[PDB]
Amino acid sequence: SILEKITSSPSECAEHITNKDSCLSKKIQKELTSFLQKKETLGCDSESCVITHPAVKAYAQQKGLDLSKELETRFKAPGPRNNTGLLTNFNIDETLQRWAIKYTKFFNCPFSMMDFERIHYKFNQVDMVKVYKGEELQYVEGKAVKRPCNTFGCVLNTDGKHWVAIFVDMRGDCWSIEYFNSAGNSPPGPVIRWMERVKQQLLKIHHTVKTLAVTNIRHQRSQTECGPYSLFYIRARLDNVSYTHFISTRITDEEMYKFRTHLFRIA
Incomplete structure (x- = not known):
């Protein structure tokens, strides 16, 4: 019942995806490598912040990609992560x-x-x-x-x-x-x-x-x-x-x- 005795972690990736680094799929990962490698320009520290930035959403959607599907899956649900x-x-x-x-x-x-x-x-x-x-x-x-x-x-x-x-x-x-x-x-x-x-x-x-x-x-x-x-x-x-x-x-x-x-x- 201590936090380290269970399998969860502070990672924002969904629990089922056993990916070593990114929570994103292989297609989305290299399709957005320009924005992923410079998160602190869009004002982001995480991947969920990037694929929700309105400009990144514009690029990938005008390129056919579905970032909303990439957010519902592969990521944990949004909520009060850092507040009470x-x-x-x-x-x-x-x-x-x-x-x-x-x-x-x-x-x-x-x-x-x-x-x-x-x-x-x-x-x-x-x-x-x-x-x-x-x-x-x-x-x-x-x-x-x-x-x-x-x-x-x-x-x-x-x-x-x-x-x-x-x-x-x-x-x-x-x-x-x-x-x-x-x-x-x-x-x-x-x-x-x-x-x-x-x-x-x-x-x-x-x-x-x-x-x-x-x-x-x-x-x-x-x-x-x-x-x-x-x-x-x-x-x-x-x-x-x-x-x-x-x-x-x-x-x-x-x-x-x-x-x-x-x-x-x-x-």
Whole structure:
């Protein structure tokens, strides 16, 4: 649960592209070598800044190239990388969507509110057996995709806009349904019933299924890191970091400030 124990990095390249230097494709890289080799003229320190400079966008588009496609892919989603701004619904969906690209068996459920028992949300409509069997729809790279998933992840709002994480591990011999709250508060009734419904569903295809509330420690003392805490839990659990770390040791908000540089590209 320390920032160096997971696979992310402060790089702005998308997590799935294993490119040594540039996040750009080979065609775009040499097509824009004139602007890439002199970033500090356009007023840029990064590649996402260059291919978003209106003049570079003019050249490559009057040359047929698609720099917007090069920005949606190959790059992490834009967001509060270097500030304590609250994470929007798009900061979270676009994060789990990009995490469905590298992590080929992860289910990126769209963000849900706490009203899912009375309002339709994909979170309350999924069937975890269909998720495991590969019969539920998830949005990866833009297309609708049905694929077998051994992991399930979602981030909900407990209503200001406070984010909490849901992670379902169906990989090992013990299947766990987890609720994480950085504020250390117990899950409300609906989530408390949702996890129990997923337990009975998963007991159809596996003999051991347990529900757990990772709500022991008040990790968050700041007012802004609800998002980074929730996204960090899913990413750490995806990298096989045990939930017992989040149960026993406090992760400071300063590590969540630092984790924001792993999440976004300024835009």
